[PDB]
Amino acid sequence: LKESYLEESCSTITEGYLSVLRTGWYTNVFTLEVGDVENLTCSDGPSLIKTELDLTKSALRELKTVSADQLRRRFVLGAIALGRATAAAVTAGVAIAKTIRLESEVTAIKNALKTTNEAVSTLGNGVRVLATAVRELKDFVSKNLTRAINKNKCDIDDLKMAVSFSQFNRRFLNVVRQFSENAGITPAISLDLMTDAELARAISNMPTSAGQIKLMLENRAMVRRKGFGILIGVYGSSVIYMVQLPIFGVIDTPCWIVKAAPSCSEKKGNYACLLREDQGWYCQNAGSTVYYPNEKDCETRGDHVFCDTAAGINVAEQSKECNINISTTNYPCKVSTGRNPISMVALSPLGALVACYKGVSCSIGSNRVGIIKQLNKGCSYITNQDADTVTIDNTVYQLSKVEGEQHVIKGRPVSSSFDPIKFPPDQFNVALDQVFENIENSQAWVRKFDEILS
Amino acid sequence: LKESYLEESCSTITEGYLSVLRTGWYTNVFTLEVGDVENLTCSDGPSLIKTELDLTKSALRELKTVSADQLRRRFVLGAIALGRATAAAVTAGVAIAKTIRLESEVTAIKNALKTTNEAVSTLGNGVRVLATAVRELKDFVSKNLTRAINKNKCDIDDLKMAVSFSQFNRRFLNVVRQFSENAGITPAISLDLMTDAELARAISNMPTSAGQIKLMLENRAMVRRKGFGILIGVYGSSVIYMVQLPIFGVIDTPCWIVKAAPSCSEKKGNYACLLREDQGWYCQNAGSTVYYPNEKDCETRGDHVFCDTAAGINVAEQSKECNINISTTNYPCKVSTGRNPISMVALSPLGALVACYKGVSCSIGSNRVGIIKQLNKGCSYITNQDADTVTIDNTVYQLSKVEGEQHVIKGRPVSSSFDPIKFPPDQFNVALDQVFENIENSQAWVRKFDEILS
Amino acid sequence: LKESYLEESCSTITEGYLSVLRTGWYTNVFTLEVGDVENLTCSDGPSLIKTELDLTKSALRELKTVSADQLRRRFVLGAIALGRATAAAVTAGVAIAKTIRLESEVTAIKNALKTTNEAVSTLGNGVRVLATAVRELKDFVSKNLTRAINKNKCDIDDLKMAVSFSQFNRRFLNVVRQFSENAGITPAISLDLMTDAELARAISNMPTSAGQIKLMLENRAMVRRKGFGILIGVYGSSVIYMVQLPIFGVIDTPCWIVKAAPSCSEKKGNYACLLREDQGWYCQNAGSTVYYPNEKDCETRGDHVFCDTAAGINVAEQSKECNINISTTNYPCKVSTGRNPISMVALSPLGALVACYKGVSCSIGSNRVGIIKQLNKGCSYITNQDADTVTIDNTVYQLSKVEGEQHVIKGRPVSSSFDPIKFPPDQFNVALDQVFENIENSQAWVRKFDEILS
Ligand SMILES: *[C@@H]1O[C@H](CO)[C@@H](O[C@@H]2O[C@H](CO)[C@@H](O[C@@H]3O[C@H](CO)[C@@H](O)[C@H](O)[C@@H]3O)[C@H](O)[C@H]2NC(C)=O)[C@H](O)[C@H]1NC(C)=O
Ligand SMILES: *[C@@H]1O[C@H](CO)[C@@H](O[C@@H]2O[C@H](CO)[C@@H](O[C@@H]3O[C@H](CO)[C@@H](O)[C@H](O)[C@@H]3O)[C@H](O)[C@H]2NC(C)=O)[C@H](O)[C@H]1NC(C)=O
Ligand SMILES: *[C@@H]1O[C@H](CO)[C@@H](O[C@@H]2O[C@H](CO)[C@@H](O[C@@H]3O[C@H](CO)[C@@H](O)[C@H](O)[C@@H]3O)[C@H](O)[C@H]2NC(C)=O)[C@H](O)[C@H]1NC(C)=O
Ligand SMILES: *[C@@H]1O[C@H](CO)[C@@H](O[C@@H]2O[C@H](CO)[C@@H](O)[C@H](O)[C@H]2NC(C)=O)[C@H](O)[C@H]1NC(C)=O
Ligand SMILES: *[C@@H]1O[C@H](CO)[C@@H](O[C@@H]2O[C@H](CO)[C@@H](O)[C@H](O)[C@H]2NC(C)=O)[C@H](O)[C@H]1NC(C)=O
Ligand SMILES: *[C@@H]1O[C@H](CO)[C@@H](O[C@@H]2O[C@H](CO)[C@@H](O)[C@H](O)[C@H]2NC(C)=O)[C@H](O)[C@H]1NC(C)=O
Ligand SMILES: *[C@@H]1O[C@H](CO)[C@@H](O)[C@H](O)[C@H]1NC(C)=O
Ligand SMILES: *[C@@H]1O[C@H](CO)[C@@H](O)[C@H](O)[C@H]1NC(C)=O
């Protein structure tokens, strides 16, 4: 990686990442088969097979009141985002589910899987899904369990059938309670909905080129992490559900992250403070720049960053000029201002930015040595090669130990160009040139008053 | 449903929903009985019964250090909300728990269930709760297990008792680890705290009319979804806990949702942008209107929307005139402004609102025939009977496929009345009439300077 | 506790808490041993041992594609916070994990545990961790399972080995599931990562005085609640992972909480409204004051509060003067303003603050008696000793029943000082003295025009 400390805007920009962007969803439709349990009875009394069999029958009866979408009746850019990714994900899932719930669709899907256990099918709206069938419990019930229970006797002396049936209905019971606890729309794929072999077999079928397929096949955990399952229904004795997986269609494209801390200048005891408000992630793609402002939707693993294209905002390319000359650009650089200092530590991938003002004591130290030194007032960039912990008055922060190259870009701070008297009041996500306009307009009105003497 | 696209404010309002509002809590008190495992020993050596029995004893000894409310010494309306619902829920739960932890209360509760397994009791503060007892592990320990383990031997050749005991203590061990892992206050009801039959038997006892009782009995999943459990304690060998369930007292009352996207007008290359800020849900009730501003607390299931009355804000009845006459109403309709366009897509229940400005390319297409057409600059409303996917420069969004009636309400945009020069700086949740006040005050001051000639 | 209702600022301050502050992390390194399962085969067909053994082998094969940090190629103070605590926690965890993944480190750690099952070791960077080994499945496989399965026969008539092996590999399969579902970094410690006895043994070894050790040993649930586990890898047949636990180094230090609700004054039908914006928690420590603005990071159990020093902001000790003299302090008291009333209820630990305005009906009542009385317009403080529920037009809130001493402080509201005409537009987190300066500047300009007559 490579990290620059920008003295002027008092912030830091770290480059050298590579993106892995989600660009669509892939749907797997699972048909879990249970068999003819609702046709088997027991009359001996208390036993093991009877307990397990009553659990299975009750699970089927319970799952028929759970519905994913039906009621059974028998400019602050960090705020414009924040709720887009999940809303879009759920909207797409329910939109496909509405199409699979029809009787013609389920009939076609079950006819595909009549003689196999996986088949690629096309729904009625032209979408291609992958249908797969789970048939272990059904085969055990038809071939083994039913033969043993002949005359409604279940207090038999086998006890191998009892333990076997306990082994075989575990996945079914787990699927049922995961859908029943979560109102029919789970928020993550467990190992009961989609196990590991089926995750690999679904990744091998996605509609992308070979490079992305290789990346996902090797890092399946991060493809399972961003999916969810939706219940379709209980048809006959089959529990039908679906699983939505991401498609990381665009890989290895530039990214960078911007971090910042307050920049405050003092004169005669009065302060003038700014703070850059365009922090977060930026990703290039096909010549266009996308800004992800809520850092809870991008996840790094190494120097790769996994991102969600539905949670970003398109920004012009001239937006990379706030990192070169924040003061005299044309782009509307976003800043927040104030008249009261804040002391804080903003950790960045290769170090920290410490802001130490009027009444706070800061220091840097290591593990084997202890307090290495103190720090002067103002803002400082502490690389993670010269320190291990950074201390504000009593708080200790542990720097991350990533390896990279650090640079410092010289320049007198912008906050030192103001007069702490005549500074405008507090602002929230304005452009910097509007701050300069406020000051200029006040000067102009005072001059207008002064010219008029008479 | 029915959705209108409002041109002047550049937003959309969807009506025809029906509410299901939470209006209180119902409390179930569970007494889970374990028996005299604490005075059963073993001396043979490793076996199955010994392993299971050590697990049960350790679970009891573990649960006695877990406490839920003691330490053992042995005007931006989206910000005023956001934390009310969950804080109120926990406050009510702990307020009742403080009353059940007394020894007189637990004595009375255990005396109610002496000869039955469910009884409605009244606490000391006049609240009526439902007390229920779970007695399967205890009966197994007293009747079956104790007789077999007679001379401190457990390496017996039965092995039906070992498997039975493993079946019987599963619920106890699950309850214990759910409370131990969550500090004593779980955030959701599992099938171990309260199973399905007990959920139905508690819904049948709530203090509401028959219509709401019918709705809740048929949609139990969404009544379990909004509860939580609190540990009361370990008394003797009984684990006593409680479960809080919602009471959806008010059903089938009008609701609507409001969505919006930026509305920007260009003159000589300078933009004036305005965005509507009163988005989210609104519900009538008894002639009053309640505005739910955080869309994370209202959840739809078809025509109906499930809402939490503690997370809403009472708004005036004229707040629905911002959807008719946004410029000339007396009501203070909230807007945000700016001078820099944003391009984005705001998905509404029957379509999308696309805002496409200076440097972004947009298109609409479907699943079968691919890209259908491009879009002109500005903001436009795209129904979901017209397209399937909407594309911003490289992002693709899949519309929801709900069925309804879409209307368009004509009008010249508000943003086309401003002069992009002489536009006020960025604002955040101001009323629109204050924007007009800023412009008029500046005009008047300039006129005052111009009149004075001398 | 003790709670004051401040009438001038229309807010409430509750004191008498004691803090339990986190000041560092402690690392446990677990080595879970599986044995030579990948060396055992079966050739009889279906049985119980074969099913369990295939599950164990598949778990090992599955866990080798999960990575916690690598990609396999094989001034609004409430916004400046909000993401510091979790980012810092994960940064520290991954920083230590990068050091334990080296082969020299794992070799040294495994050499410590050669002849014992717990040992305190020091890594290569000087940090001291606690290494512990889990050896039950491995000993069962070497001593019992391997001998019985002699010539690839597993359809044997034991059935005690089958149940025993089901009992023994449960913890291993659960650990593998928890790391595989969560991409290799779980967000909480379950009872499978670190059980209870090992939590007690890790707390006994922390680097703090005896008093903090005693507090943590007695309230272990709240120490497990704030940790997480990270996967280090699979080495041979050993699954190596780590667990990060908090160190509550500073205990029993003063805290207080500040709550507030809108304060609006009416004249001739026009309202001037003011709301106080420095709400949340405050803690002393060593003569400094720390302000925690996001209430989601501080959690109370009794009159104790479990804060997190990485999520707070250092504030000057004159900040408390906002609770005594909000108008004339020499301190930037943060307020929001408006011209439209809001009616709402802010629940404070010993009562509620009800704001009732233009068109809202409020009342207070109890359980046994019902509606006790109505409330006048304005803001009022309802202690939790003369009421149980507070009702806004149709919403009912249940007060908390904590016991303390309530105390009202006299004074005329600040909002009665303003003129509802000539009130500045809506503000958001400005200092109060800036509002006064705004009004004064407007008066001065009007006077300047009035003086000039000519
Ligand atoms: C644990 O102990 C209980 C009670 O000691 C056992 O329940 C007993 O099961 C027998 C089964 O023979 C039942 O008695 C008889 O039931 C048959 C029909 O199954 C019928 O001929 C009569 O109705 C007769 O009463 C009864 O449920 C019960 N016996 C008594 C005396 O209560 C249970 O089986 C034991 N469980 C295990 C796993 O050992
Ligand atoms: C549940 O039922 C299935 C099928 O009834 C059982 O699978 C069968 O298990 C037997 C066990 O011996 C296998 O027999 C084998 O026959 C072949 C052909 O001669 C030969 O390799 C041996 O002589 C061996 O005995 C059989 O292949 C296998 N499958 C079928 C279709 O019969 C299964 O064991 C039962 N499970 C339980 C727990 O009862
Ligand atoms: C797994 O393997 C171990 C080791 O082979 C088995 O443990 C064995 O259990 C016997 C029980 O008979 C124990 O023998 C000892 O005998 C003396 C004298 O009777 C007594 O004082 C001890 O307390 C103990 O009972 C011993 O733990 C062990 N035998 C050895 C090491 O020779 C264990 O049974 C196996 N697990 C299963 C499920 O088979
Ligand atoms: C259990 O047995 C009953 C028969 O007593 C089955 O019910 C019939 O099954 C056939 C098979 O297709 C249908 O054609 C009949 O219409 C069924 N009868 C009724 C009244 O519906 C029942 O299906 C069996 N259980 C299962 C799970 O198949
Ligand atoms: C051991 O089992 C007995 C069953 O009778 C439990 O009852 C107590 O037994 C002790 C004798 O050790 C008596 O002194 C007590 O008076 C009995 N209890 C009562 C209420 O009378 C006993 O609790 C069990 N032991 C443990 C430790 O639980
Ligand atoms: C199961 O057996 C194989 C083959 O014996 C083990 O692989 C190595 O085999 C060589 C002989 O070619 C031995 O010298 C090594 O010692 C074996 N490896 C080890 C780690 O001992 C294989 O390792 C065995 N399974 C396990 C889990 O060790
Ligand atoms: C704006 O339209 C609403 C719609 O009925 C109307 O009631 C209101 O009087 C209008 N505002 C005016 C006329 O200033
Ligand atoms: C306001 O009250 C505080 C409370 O002690 C006091 O210290 C301060 O001096 C007061 N303000 C002025 C201007 O005196």
Author numbering:
A (entry chain C), B (entry chain B), C (entry chain A): 19 to 92, 103 to 482
Sentences from the paper on this structure:
The hMPV fusion protein F is a class I fusion protein present on the viral surface and essential for viral entry. It is initially synthesized as a single chain precursor F0, which is cleaved by host cell proteases into disulfide-linked F2 and F1 subunits, with the latter bearing the fusion peptide at its N-terminus. F mediates the fusion of viral and host cell membranes through a large conformational change from the metastable prefusion (Pre-F) to the highly stable postfusion (Post-F) conformation. Since Pre-F is the target for neutralizing antibodies, development of an efficacious hMPV vaccine is aimed at stabilizing this conformation.
